Amino acid sequence: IAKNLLYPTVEEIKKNNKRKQLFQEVKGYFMEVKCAGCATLNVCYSHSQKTISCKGCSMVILRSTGGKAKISNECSYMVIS
Amino acid sequence: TKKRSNNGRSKKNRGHTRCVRCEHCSAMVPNDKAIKKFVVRSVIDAASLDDLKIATIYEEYEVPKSYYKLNYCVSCAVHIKLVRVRSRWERKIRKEQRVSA
Amino acid sequence: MYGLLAARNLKKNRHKRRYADKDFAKKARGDIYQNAVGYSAPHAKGIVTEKLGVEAKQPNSAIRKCVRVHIVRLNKKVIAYVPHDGGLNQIEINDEVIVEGLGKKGCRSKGDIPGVRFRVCKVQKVSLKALVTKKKERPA
Amino acid sequence: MMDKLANLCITINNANRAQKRSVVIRRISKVCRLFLESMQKHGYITDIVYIDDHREGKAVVGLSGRLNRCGAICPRYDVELKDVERYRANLLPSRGFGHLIVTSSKGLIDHRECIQHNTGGKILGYFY
Amino acid sequence: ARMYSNGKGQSKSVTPYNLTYPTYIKHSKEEIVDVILNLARKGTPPSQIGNILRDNYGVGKSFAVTKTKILTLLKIAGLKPVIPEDLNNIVKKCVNIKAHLAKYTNDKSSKYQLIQMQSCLYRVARYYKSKNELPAGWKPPF
RNA sequence: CAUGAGUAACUGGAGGUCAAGGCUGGUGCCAGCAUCCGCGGUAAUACCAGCUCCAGGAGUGUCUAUGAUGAUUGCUGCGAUUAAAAGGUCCGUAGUCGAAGAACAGUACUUGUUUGUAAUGUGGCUUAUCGAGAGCCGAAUAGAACGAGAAGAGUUCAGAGUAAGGAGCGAAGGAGGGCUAGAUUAUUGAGCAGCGAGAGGUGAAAUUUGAUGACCUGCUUAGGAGUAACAGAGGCGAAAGCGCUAGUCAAGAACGAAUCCGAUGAUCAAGGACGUAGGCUGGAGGAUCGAAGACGAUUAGAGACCGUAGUAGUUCCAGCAGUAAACGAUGCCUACGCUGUUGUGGUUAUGAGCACGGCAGAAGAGAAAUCUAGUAGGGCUUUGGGGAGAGUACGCGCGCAA
RNA sequence: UGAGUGCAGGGUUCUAGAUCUGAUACAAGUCGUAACAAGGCAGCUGUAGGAGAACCUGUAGCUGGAUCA
């Protein structure tokens, strides 16, 4: 065998389609987002199919789109899973 | 035997196209096959511009142009000598022609 | 049709294909018993009714000597060719002749003779080759 | 869908012609494993790894310089021990070398082992 | 390829390698099981149950916590529908096309779409009435 | 065993295939020969004879069926871009063909033992001078009885979830389709006003129209078609096909992603639905163009090509019909496969991908031209077998007819 | 149980027939010249009229075209 064929470089991994690999890769992940102002934390999915509003203050925190969802201008997040 | 790879026309990924009429003989020809010619002609001939300079009332004048797109069927284009017969290797060369006046 | 349990489909298809062969078709679906010499018999007896001549096909230039024969076994009348150099002189009207095939796959014309399909073999019970070359004489 | 044992053969035949030394084969079944394991016993292929991807399966293999050709037969004809030499003479290039593989109640075996064990079976494929 | 047309699309979503337990989440097992059965009684399809659980409550693929599948849980709770939800969505689209054609009779393209749709219904029916999921003499609403 | 003796070859051929003569005399496209190709018109190695050679030989020529020749019937093993040959497009029953993982069972499958073949045939040995011949031996096909093995095939399961299918979610794209309400010009026709002699048409002209005012320029109106330029080796649709602007009504394709169900699938006789144009049955309408018909020219003649004019049709609604060079002359699923460049729509670690394309080489392939044609016992349907007669006759099914 | 034979019909295969209409071969007859060169109006496929005869004319299509522009 060839090392190149049995163990691809991480560069090669990132260029391929998610299915066309030796082992298929998950692209979606979960995150904790915190609201500007009220500083409450909400669990969200990347690639969300639904618009989401902050607990309590009801500010729209996350907007659904054709691809990866859009966090509102002031808010911030961390990957949890 | 098959003479041209594109069957002599520009249709691909379509069933059917609009027809147009030949300028010289009014024959119907498909739009994607017709020979096309562009013209931009001054309303006034070059041999008169030196008289125009003394005839006009205005301080300066720009002559109006006239614009045309003409269409020809194969027989007319060959006969009027817009196109000519070419050798088996020349047939493949594609280049844009000049706009006429 | 190439599956392991496909034998029935395969057999019925391949049988139907064979009718495209002219040979198999004629044996199956044509009139193979219409002829004086053929599937039916190797030789045929008949009586001479008229003497006849025919032009050769182009580019040759000749008159070929032929005979009108009434065939005993079918009651058809047919044209036959008389092979040898002076052969026509060995035959009288109302003689009996035996007649033979020209040797093609179907009954077909041979050489330059248009539309004639048999040839004479014996006259009055004796070989025409012997008659012409004067090796034997007419029964009289 | 294509037959998995046919797919295996075309994948290695083309790669061999293109002078590659290794390939990945994308859909694998139980008899495909046993076929590859046969080619390893006779030294036609060198190294085998199997990937357990939960999506069918896939294999990575190293080719030797000794492999000229392989192929599957479809359908898988039943043969008596009397019949196998007919197929041997049809498929293989020489009486001296190469293998015709047959499935039997004793696993995959070659046309010589058929004589030793005294058994026919079903015809599967060949390599030389 | 596609069944009624010349399509060869490839858009799907990847199933994980292992499933674990979603420890990052903010509810118990029993709460998640309560959320499902509520959404069910309100009349939502089980594919929508899955979407909500992922989007709002933060659970992927809705099985890592429960060790049981959504439709099986609904049968355990007794909330099973009269017709499988796939066959049900095919009858709806047929009705819609017939209601359009009823007022716009001239539409040859809609006529074309109806005969395709109707074929798909009976192909699905014959599956279910073999697995004993429908009565043998069931017929479309038409 | 013993007596006499000295007898005993023909059939087909000799230009090529195909072994063996440009030998001598007759005949001059005659008479004849020749399976096929071909010989002969006065210098015939091919006819008719003489003489020498060749081949097989107690035998050799001919006719007729058949097996082989022949991969020109194709299971092994042919073809379908242009030589003969992929159904105009879909749906669909019978039929043929159908994941991974973990297990289970023995009727096919393969094999043992035992039955099942006189003659013929097969492997042998022994005796008629020899050789066929005769006599004796051994094993045997298909078919059946009882055991055995479990890879492939088959049946089941769910702490399993296809670059298999169907249902559903999110943001977006397109001359895809039906309906409602509007639009800028243009071509004809009428009304009225101005002007006062030609307009039209062609390679060149005549029919023809104009003082009842043409032509051209104004203002008014009435209709019925159409959507120029932008506009492309651009887009959409199952194909046929689809190009002005708004509003409205259903369904579909593709893309993103940790949604749901679980074999629901491929291809398809019979049966069913769509199908440019021209045509037919009934209604509406009728601007432009124009089969038929009628003239003017040109020609030996033009019935045609050109010009004047003119009807059915050309448009719409409700139906019938079922053909096209319905063509990329290349069936549908599913694979394995080199590089560079340019598009269209989404998505993006901004490195790239996925679907649908164009172009230019390479390597292989092929009779070449060229490449939807490379590699290959993957599955299923259609289809060809030297020219003609013939896609014709008779019968049958659909259609108002064609 | 039934041979034979009446009388109507059918199913098969052959054969007669005034007259009409195909095809094939016609050494070389009569009238034109439709195709193959831009063959003297570029050719061909479907459909509909017309015509001594090849064929001509309208409508949609194709290049196997005289143009890969």
Ligand SMILES: [Zn+2]
């Ligand atoms: Zn907040």
Ligand SMILES: [Zn+2]
């Ligand atoms: Zn023209």
